[PDB]
Amino acid sequence: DKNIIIGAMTALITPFKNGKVDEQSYARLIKRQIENGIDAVVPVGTTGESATLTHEEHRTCIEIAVETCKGTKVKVLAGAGSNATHEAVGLAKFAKEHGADGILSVAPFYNKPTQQGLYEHYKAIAQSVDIPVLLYNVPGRTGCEISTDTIIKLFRDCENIYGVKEASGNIDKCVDLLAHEPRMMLISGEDAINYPILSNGGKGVISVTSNLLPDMISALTHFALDENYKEAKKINDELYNINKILFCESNPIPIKTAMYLAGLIESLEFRLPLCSPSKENFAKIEEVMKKYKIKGF
Amino acid sequence: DKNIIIGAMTALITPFKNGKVDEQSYARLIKRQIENGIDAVVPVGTTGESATLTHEEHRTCIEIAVETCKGTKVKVLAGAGSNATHEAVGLAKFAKEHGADGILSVAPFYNKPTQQGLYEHYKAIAQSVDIPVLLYNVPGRTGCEISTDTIIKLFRDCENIYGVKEASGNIDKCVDLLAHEPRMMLISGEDAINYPILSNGGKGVISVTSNLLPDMISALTHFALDENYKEAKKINDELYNINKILFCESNPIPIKTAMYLAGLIESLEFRLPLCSPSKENFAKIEEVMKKYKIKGF
Amino acid sequence: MDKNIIIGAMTALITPFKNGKVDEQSYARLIKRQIENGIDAVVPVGTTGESATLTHEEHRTCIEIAVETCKGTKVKVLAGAGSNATHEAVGLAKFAKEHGADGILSVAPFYNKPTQQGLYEHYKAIAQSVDIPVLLYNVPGRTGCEISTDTIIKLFRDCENIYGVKEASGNIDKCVDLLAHEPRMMLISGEDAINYPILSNGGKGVISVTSNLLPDMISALTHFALDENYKEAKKINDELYNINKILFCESNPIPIKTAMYLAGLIESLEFRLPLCSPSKENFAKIEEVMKKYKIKGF
Amino acid sequence: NIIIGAMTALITPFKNGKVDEQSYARLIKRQIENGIDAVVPVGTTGESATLTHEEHRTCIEIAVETCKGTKVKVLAGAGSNATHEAVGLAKFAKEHGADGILSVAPFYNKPTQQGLYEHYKAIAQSVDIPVLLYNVPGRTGCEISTDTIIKLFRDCENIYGVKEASGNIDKCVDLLAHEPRMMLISGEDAINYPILSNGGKGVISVTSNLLPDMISALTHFALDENYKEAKKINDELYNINKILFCESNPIPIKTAMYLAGLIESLEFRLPLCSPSKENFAKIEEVMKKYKIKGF
């Protein structure tokens, strides 16, 4: 079998304080995930503003997550993607030496590689490290789609590519993947449809919502894995509202905003071109939050 | 509190011979559905080439279904919709007059009414009969979408409107619908994702595939309704290839092609503008069919 | 080839209702207004004319009124006669010819999504049924299907009657494609906001929603462009942008009928379900945009 | 101050994994000798994603030196989805002697319109040279709205227009109807003529790597209001304009340049790679229809 990283996972926000990553806060937030039943954390993914972080800042976040998760079952699945293969290989290698348990590698954004290019991109990445590699398909952001065929071919040709984080709002593709390759780990990258993905044999979530509600996302995931579909569906339905409003502006603007409103972070800072939401959206976010029980530290 | 028509349902093809409805074949095909565990049939829907049947033919097909199903538990959910409200109302009242147990009424195509018009459209239809009305949302065909809000208002405001056939490939909307209104009957109008819809609380399917494999579709649906999700998923996975190929060209072109190849209908005859599939797709359909056990008469 | 054509500035006529029936006296008045403002042809019972909700008889009546009202003028009648059932479309085609239409506009089959092959046979059957010009109509946003460039060109070349296409797809690339491979066909704009770009690329006319309200401006635009006075045609197209967009704030013809009502050109603002009156807000928006334009009287 | 007319989005030729610098200059010289008004080093067609910052600087400098003493201007690609990086790239381009910069909308991270606004304002405030916005939603996952383009044009003196690659002539009408002063630049070869005939003032072309003389003639005919001649060229070029997109740009253009003997090797940087054998043969076929100018 392949080595895998599954279960309830959080795409960690990266808190800033006067432009700099807030390291005490970051560690404090990770610890809060762990104490609320989360199985893995993802430093410096999309939700962690990877695009505007430096290479050094990636290292710092990965190291903090690794350190914090040390001596626990919680794994670190490090964001380590790029639209340049040489960069992506480099980032994977670095994540590996910093002690990450695996990497999440987003499909090349902006330059629209062909399916053949995608295949070689990921093959190079997978052959550069010996840790699990999770594909990440989010065509709304990247402008390309890793086809089911390409995903399956990568799973079958590269030993450490074990699955895909799917953020495409396409349940038909999920059926397709698991009908043809049942050894695949399909991971939900879309909070609103966590349950439908899990009930079709998906094996985890990489969640934005779990930043704010780690206990509910882990319970949902664990219920689903336990084949308690009733309880998992109940949680998924009650979370629908917040799962949508967290995208009323581009992620992670709403989640960071909500984290701040909840007193989980000290200051609401983004790195350009991300910025504070409109005062209207700030209100919409504050409105939905107050309808949920939020765990402190 | 509502009267409903749920479970495994077939969108019946309409067989032609010499440019006419083959009335004997039609009755024979329906009997095959009855004997294979189907809970309801849908005469003159999209799969029955409703657009190209005359009024007298609409009648003929509904009567045959009504007469063939009499004395069995199998219901008739008649296709009766139009993009003109006075016509839709007329068809609704005719269907009831012919003895249909309920109606399936497609959102107005081509003229793109606003949500207010959709509401009034369906309110008028629902008030004209005293049998169950199921909404039918299929944006790719109609050019419009019944919003979740409109769907829920109609369900709550109109006594006989009891659910929606969703054919939009949007599992997010399905979560949305059942989270805000858990009492409605959400019916799958998309074969490949039957299981996901049912596993989220959907209560039936209106299937194209069941023309060919009524036993497998009824078993899938009944397993899911019995909360045997493992066996429902198993069947949905096996069906994925044929579910997919049955839409390689616009339905009902592939399903009729398959029915002809299976020897279930005499001729592969369509009414223009529908026609035989491409020879490439014909081959694909013929190949995919080999993997399944098709029931005869 | 060398075909019989119907081109120039054309209006997709609205169908005024009074008390749930077609207002026939009003229909005639609106057509006279188009004629006197330089319009080259009128299209009775198109999408803008709420074709979907008219009866076969009302469809007849509208064509007859258009035919009688244009009699003795240079203005031609290009009757809507589309359907998603080929036998019905053939019937509507013969219908229109019999009632004196100079040509037909035939929309691509909506809802049932025929293949390119089925589209070809659909139009071939229609073309062979009458001896008057046939204009194709591609509006994918409404029908759920697109007639490809290949299919349009094949139809143009194989069928004597088919002389062009009304394109409402917002895809200027396809227009380039069409006229690059088949420079003999009449490409007609069915998208008002972009009449000028279509005309400047060799398009030969428009079938306009906006001309219902501003027939003098649309006809001026078209003739400037047809005379290669492109700078003047552009000026008008830019001036018309505001109203061209607002007329689709809700589905055509809800906004145009509302505007005709607001201009005092029709007696009542009535639609047939599932179409209905616009929201109060869009009513206000239409009213405000209209104030920037000179609207010809009766 | 502006940069308009017929412009080329330069491909970046590789040799043994490195930028072939001699080949690069020779290509730019060929563009100059065929009537091109400006060249765009290291845009999307130049595989900007896969070049290091030093390679970026090198291409810009080679463009600047090669254009020295001619009327041809250098509009440098300097976009990024991180504002701190975009500003840095812009400032480097300026100190390398670029005449202006072409700055793509932040890709992947989907900024809000307010964020795009602050992003571009910061870029524009960082240099005193002209700045051309670049809208290509298909690649970035976001769109600079017409309102945002107009605000930025009006609020920042040196933001002078937008390269539009959205395949949406309606937006082009909207832009020039509400703000005619801006320079609308076609970023989509197949519809160069329609954009120019509506008041566009230039093209940033993929095709002109291969056929610089036809693209510049098209553009110049259009600017001279000779629409008949501009259309005729746009129509002739339609086949090549489409086939150059049968796979993601710049895969086809580089393949064609290779087949034409204009660059030495058909070499990309991953995740880009050679086209399929089918597309390769299709590209070869379409090329036979056009006269490809030499050096």
PDB file of all heavy atoms in Angstrom, chain A residues 51-73:
ATOM      1  N   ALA A  51       0.828  32.392  -1.869  1.00  0.00           N
ATOM      2  CA  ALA A  51       1.234  33.238  -3.000  1.00  0.00           C
ATOM      3  C   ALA A  51       2.062  34.460  -2.590  1.00  0.00           C
ATOM      4  O   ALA A  51       2.954  34.880  -3.315  1.00  0.00           O
ATOM      5  CB  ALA A  51       0.009  33.680  -3.799  1.00  0.00           C
ATOM      6  N   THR A  52       1.762  35.027  -1.428  1.00  0.00           N
ATOM      7  CA  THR A  52       2.418  36.252  -0.987  1.00  0.00           C
ATOM      8  C   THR A  52       3.474  36.026   0.099  1.00  0.00           C
ATOM      9  O   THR A  52       4.121  36.971   0.546  1.00  0.00           O
ATOM     10  CB  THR A  52       1.389  37.253  -0.462  1.00  0.00           C
ATOM     11  OG1 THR A  52       0.702  36.675   0.657  1.00  0.00           O
ATOM     12  CG2 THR A  52       0.383  37.607  -1.567  1.00  0.00           C
ATOM     13  N   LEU A  53       3.638  34.779   0.526  1.00  0.00           N
ATOM     14  CA  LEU A  53       4.685  34.430   1.482  1.00  0.00           C
ATOM     15  C   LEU A  53       6.016  34.233   0.768  1.00  0.00           C
ATOM     16  O   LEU A  53       6.044  33.822  -0.388  1.00  0.00           O
ATOM     17  CB  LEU A  53       4.327  33.151   2.232  1.00  0.00           C
ATOM     18  CG  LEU A  53       3.132  33.263   3.175  1.00  0.00           C
ATOM     19  CD1 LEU A  53       2.985  31.971   3.961  1.00  0.00           C
ATOM     20  CD2 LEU A  53       3.315  34.444   4.103  1.00  0.00           C
ATOM     21  N   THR A  54       7.118  34.526   1.456  1.00  0.00           N
ATOM     22  CA  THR A  54       8.435  34.193   0.916  1.00  0.00           C
ATOM     23  C   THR A  54       8.784  32.725   1.166  1.00  0.00           C
ATOM     24  O   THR A  54       8.111  32.036   1.940  1.00  0.00           O
ATOM     25  CB  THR A  54       9.544  35.083   1.501  1.00  0.00           C
ATOM     26  OG1 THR A  54       9.602  34.914   2.920  1.00  0.00           O
ATOM     27  CG2 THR A  54       9.266  36.538   1.190  1.00  0.00           C
ATOM     28  N   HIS A  55       9.837  32.262   0.497  1.00  0.00           N
ATOM     29  CA  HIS A  55      10.372  30.925   0.698  1.00  0.00           C
ATOM     30  C   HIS A  55      10.747  30.703   2.159  1.00  0.00           C
ATOM     31  O   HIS A  55      10.417  29.671   2.740  1.00  0.00           O
ATOM     32  CB  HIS A  55      11.593  30.704  -0.198  1.00  0.00           C
ATOM     33  CG  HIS A  55      11.247  30.443  -1.634  1.00  0.00           C
ATOM     34  ND1 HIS A  55      10.011  29.974  -2.028  1.00  0.00           N
ATOM     35  CD2 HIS A  55      11.971  30.592  -2.768  1.00  0.00           C
ATOM     36  CE1 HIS A  55       9.991  29.839  -3.342  1.00  0.00           C
ATOM     37  NE2 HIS A  55      11.167  30.207  -3.815  1.00  0.00           N
ATOM     38  N   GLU A  56      11.426  31.682   2.743  1.00  0.00           N
ATOM     39  CA  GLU A  56      11.766  31.652   4.160  1.00  0.00           C
ATOM     40  C   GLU A  56      10.523  31.540   5.046  1.00  0.00           C
ATOM     41  O   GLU A  56      10.518  30.787   6.017  1.00  0.00           O
ATOM     42  CB  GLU A  56      12.581  32.894   4.539  1.00  0.00           C
ATOM     43  CG  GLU A  56      12.760  33.091   6.039  1.00  0.00           C
ATOM     44  CD  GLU A  56      11.845  34.170   6.616  1.00  0.00           C
ATOM     45  OE1 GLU A  56      11.996  35.357   6.238  1.00  0.00           O
ATOM     46  OE2 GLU A  56      10.973  33.829   7.452  1.00  0.00           O
ATOM     47  N   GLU A  57       9.474  32.283   4.702  1.00  0.00           N
ATOM     48  CA  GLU A  57       8.223  32.243   5.458  1.00  0.00           C
ATOM     49  C   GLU A  57       7.526  30.872   5.355  1.00  0.00           C
ATOM     50  O   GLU A  57       6.963  30.393   6.338  1.00  0.00           O
ATOM     51  CB  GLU A  57       7.305  33.410   5.065  1.00  0.00           C
ATOM     52  CG  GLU A  57       7.715  34.760   5.699  1.00  0.00           C
ATOM     53  CD  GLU A  57       7.083  35.996   5.024  1.00  0.00           C
ATOM     54  OE1 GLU A  57       6.635  35.893   3.863  1.00  0.00           O
ATOM     55  OE2 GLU A  57       7.045  37.077   5.659  1.00  0.00           O
ATOM     56  N   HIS A  58       7.596  30.231   4.186  1.00  0.00           N
ATOM     57  CA  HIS A  58       7.168  28.832   4.041  1.00  0.00           C
ATOM     58  C   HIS A  58       7.904  27.916   5.025  1.00  0.00           C
ATOM     59  O   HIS A  58       7.280  27.147   5.757  1.00  0.00           O
ATOM     60  CB  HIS A  58       7.417  28.311   2.617  1.00  0.00           C
ATOM     61  CG  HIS A  58       6.424  28.791   1.603  1.00  0.00           C
ATOM     62  ND1 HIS A  58       5.764  27.934   0.749  1.00  0.00           N
ATOM     63  CD2 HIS A  58       5.992  30.039   1.295  1.00  0.00           C
ATOM     64  CE1 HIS A  58       4.961  28.632  -0.038  1.00  0.00           C
ATOM     65  NE2 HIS A  58       5.081  29.911   0.273  1.00  0.00           N
ATOM     66  N   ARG A  59       9.233  27.996   5.018  1.00  0.00           N
ATOM     67  CA  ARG A  59      10.078  27.223   5.921  1.00  0.00           C
ATOM     68  C   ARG A  59       9.678  27.437   7.373  1.00  0.00           C
ATOM     69  O   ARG A  59       9.554  26.487   8.144  1.00  0.00           O
ATOM     70  CB  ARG A  59      11.555  27.603   5.729  1.00  0.00           C
ATOM     71  CG  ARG A  59      12.454  27.193   6.890  1.00  0.00           C
ATOM     72  CD  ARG A  59      13.931  27.437   6.608  1.00  0.00           C
ATOM     73  NE  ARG A  59      14.382  28.766   7.021  1.00  0.00           N
ATOM     74  CZ  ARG A  59      14.745  29.732   6.180  1.00  0.00           C
ATOM     75  NH1 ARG A  59      14.713  29.530   4.868  1.00  0.00           N
ATOM     76  NH2 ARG A  59      15.145  30.903   6.652  1.00  0.00           N
ATOM     77  N   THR A  60       9.463  28.695   7.734  1.00  0.00           N
ATOM     78  CA  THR A  60       9.154  29.046   9.106  1.00  0.00           C
ATOM     79  C   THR A  60       7.831  28.425   9.552  1.00  0.00           C
ATOM     80  O   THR A  60       7.741  27.845  10.628  1.00  0.00           O
ATOM     81  CB  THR A  60       9.094  30.570   9.281  1.00  0.00           C
ATOM     82  OG1 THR A  60      10.409  31.109   9.137  1.00  0.00           O
ATOM     83  CG2 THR A  60       8.557  30.929  10.665  1.00  0.00           C
ATOM     84  N   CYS A  61       6.812  28.555   8.711  1.00  0.00           N
ATOM     85  CA  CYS A  61       5.503  27.991   8.998  1.00  0.00           C
ATOM     86  C   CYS A  61       5.548  26.470   9.055  1.00  0.00           C
ATOM     87  O   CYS A  61       4.974  25.855   9.958  1.00  0.00           O
ATOM     88  CB  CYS A  61       4.494  28.452   7.943  1.00  0.00           C
ATOM     89  SG  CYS A  61       4.072  30.227   8.077  1.00  0.00           S
ATOM     90  N   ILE A  62       6.235  25.859   8.096  1.00  0.00           N
ATOM     91  CA  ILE A  62       6.337  24.410   8.091  1.00  0.00           C
ATOM     92  C   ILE A  62       7.030  23.928   9.370  1.00  0.00           C
ATOM     93  O   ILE A  62       6.536  23.015  10.050  1.00  0.00           O
ATOM     94  CB  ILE A  62       7.034  23.884   6.827  1.00  0.00           C
ATOM     95  CG1 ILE A  62       6.164  24.185   5.601  1.00  0.00           C
ATOM     96  CG2 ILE A  62       7.274  22.379   6.944  1.00  0.00           C
ATOM     97  CD1 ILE A  62       6.851  23.930   4.236  1.00  0.00           C
ATOM     98  N   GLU A  63       8.138  24.578   9.722  1.00  0.00           N
ATOM     99  CA  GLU A  63       8.870  24.217  10.936  1.00  0.00           C
ATOM    100  C   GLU A  63       8.024  24.328  12.192  1.00  0.00           C
ATOM    101  O   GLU A  63       8.048  23.440  13.028  1.00  0.00           O
ATOM    102  CB  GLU A  63      10.150  25.047  11.092  1.00  0.00           C
ATOM    103  CG  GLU A  63      11.289  24.560  10.231  1.00  0.00           C
ATOM    104  CD  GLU A  63      12.480  25.488  10.267  1.00  0.00           C
ATOM    105  OE1 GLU A  63      12.416  26.518  10.971  1.00  0.00           O
ATOM    106  OE2 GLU A  63      13.480  25.190   9.580  1.00  0.00           O
ATOM    107  N   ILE A  64       7.272  25.416  12.321  1.00  0.00           N
ATOM    108  CA  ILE A  64       6.415  25.607  13.486  1.00  0.00           C
ATOM    109  C   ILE A  64       5.355  24.509  13.582  1.00  0.00           C
ATOM    110  O   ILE A  64       5.135  23.944  14.654  1.00  0.00           O
ATOM    111  CB  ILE A  64       5.791  27.018  13.487  1.00  0.00           C
ATOM    112  CG1 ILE A  64       6.892  28.051  13.741  1.00  0.00           C
ATOM    113  CG2 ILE A  64       4.721  27.147  14.552  1.00  0.00           C
ATOM    114  CD1 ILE A  64       6.484  29.468  13.490  1.00  0.00           C
ATOM    115  N   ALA A  65       4.719  24.192  12.457  1.00  0.00           N
ATOM    116  CA  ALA A  65       3.727  23.118  12.428  1.00  0.00           C
ATOM    117  C   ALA A  65       4.348  21.760  12.781  1.00  0.00           C
ATOM    118  O   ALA A  65       3.810  21.016  13.605  1.00  0.00           O
ATOM    119  CB  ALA A  65       3.009  23.063  11.062  1.00  0.00           C
ATOM    120  N   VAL A  66       5.473  21.445  12.152  1.00  0.00           N
ATOM    121  CA  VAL A  66       6.207  20.237  12.486  1.00  0.00           C
ATOM    122  C   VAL A  66       6.506  20.175  13.990  1.00  0.00           C
ATOM    123  O   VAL A  66       6.165  19.185  14.642  1.00  0.00           O
ATOM    124  CB  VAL A  66       7.536  20.155  11.704  1.00  0.00           C
ATOM    125  CG1 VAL A  66       8.434  19.087  12.305  1.00  0.00           C
ATOM    126  CG2 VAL A  66       7.271  19.883  10.236  1.00  0.00           C
ATOM    127  N   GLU A  67       7.119  21.234  14.535  1.00  0.00           N
ATOM    128  CA  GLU A  67       7.507  21.273  15.957  1.00  0.00           C
ATOM    129  C   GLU A  67       6.304  21.051  16.867  1.00  0.00           C
ATOM    130  O   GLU A  67       6.365  20.296  17.831  1.00  0.00           O
ATOM    131  CB  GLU A  67       8.130  22.622  16.347  1.00  0.00           C
ATOM    132  CG  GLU A  67       9.448  22.994  15.687  1.00  0.00           C
ATOM    133  CD  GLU A  67       9.800  24.482  15.889  1.00  0.00           C
ATOM    134  OE1 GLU A  67       9.050  25.186  16.604  1.00  0.00           O
ATOM    135  OE2 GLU A  67      10.820  24.953  15.334  1.00  0.00           O
ATOM    136  N   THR A  68       5.222  21.750  16.560  1.00  0.00           N
ATOM    137  CA  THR A  68       4.032  21.723  17.383  1.00  0.00           C
ATOM    138  C   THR A  68       3.364  20.354  17.356  1.00  0.00           C
ATOM    139  O   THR A  68       2.820  19.900  18.364  1.00  0.00           O
ATOM    140  CB  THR A  68       3.034  22.792  16.906  1.00  0.00           C
ATOM    141  OG1 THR A  68       3.684  24.071  16.909  1.00  0.00           O
ATOM    142  CG2 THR A  68       1.820  22.835  17.818  1.00  0.00           C
ATOM    143  N   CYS A  69       3.419  19.697  16.203  1.00  0.00           N
ATOM    144  CA  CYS A  69       2.734  18.423  16.015  1.00  0.00           C
ATOM    145  C   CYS A  69       3.602  17.260  16.478  1.00  0.00           C
ATOM    146  O   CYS A  69       3.146  16.118  16.539  1.00  0.00           O
ATOM    147  CB  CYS A  69       2.311  18.236  14.549  1.00  0.00           C
ATOM    148  SG  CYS A  69       0.979  19.355  13.997  1.00  0.00           S
ATOM    149  N   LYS A  70       4.850  17.566  16.809  1.00  0.00           N
ATOM    150  CA  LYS A  70       5.800  16.563  17.257  1.00  0.00           C
ATOM    151  C   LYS A  70       5.337  15.968  18.589  1.00  0.00           C
ATOM    152  O   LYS A  70       4.942  16.693  19.495  1.00  0.00           O
ATOM    153  CB  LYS A  70       7.182  17.197  17.394  1.00  0.00           C
ATOM    154  CG  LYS A  70       8.346  16.249  17.196  1.00  0.00           C
ATOM    155  CD  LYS A  70       9.676  16.981  17.365  1.00  0.00           C
ATOM    156  CE  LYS A  70      10.834  15.991  17.525  1.00  0.00           C
ATOM    157  NZ  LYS A  70      12.147  16.666  17.741  1.00  0.00           N
ATOM    158  N   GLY A  71       5.366  14.645  18.700  1.00  0.00           N
ATOM    159  CA  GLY A  71       4.916  13.988  19.912  1.00  0.00           C
ATOM    160  C   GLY A  71       3.409  13.823  19.920  1.00  0.00           C
ATOM    161  O   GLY A  71       2.819  13.573  20.965  1.00  0.00           O
ATOM    162  N   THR A  72       2.781  13.988  18.758  1.00  0.00           N
ATOM    163  CA  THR A  72       1.347  13.750  18.618  1.00  0.00           C
ATOM    164  C   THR A  72       1.088  12.945  17.357  1.00  0.00           C
ATOM    165  O   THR A  72       1.986  12.727  16.550  1.00  0.00           O
ATOM    166  CB  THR A  72       0.527  15.053  18.495  1.00  0.00           C
ATOM    167  OG1 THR A  72       0.605  15.544  17.148  1.00  0.00           O
ATOM    168  CG2 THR A  72       1.018  16.120  19.475  1.00  0.00           C
ATOM    169  N   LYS A  73      -0.151  12.516  17.178  1.00  0.00           N
ATOM    170  CA  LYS A  73      -0.509  11.759  15.992  1.00  0.00           C
ATOM    171  C   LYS A  73      -0.694  12.674  14.792  1.00  0.00           C
ATOM    172  O   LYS A  73      -0.692  12.212  13.658  1.00  0.00           O
ATOM    173  CB  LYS A  73      -1.779  10.951  16.226  1.00  0.00           C
ATOM    174  CG  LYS A  73      -3.037  11.773  16.424  1.00  0.00           C
ATOM    175  CD  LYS A  73      -4.263  10.854  16.448  1.00  0.00           C
ATOM    176  CE  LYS A  73      -5.437  11.456  17.219  1.00  0.00           C
ATOM    177  NZ  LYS A  73      -6.030  12.641  16.537  1.00  0.00           N
TER     178      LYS A  73
END
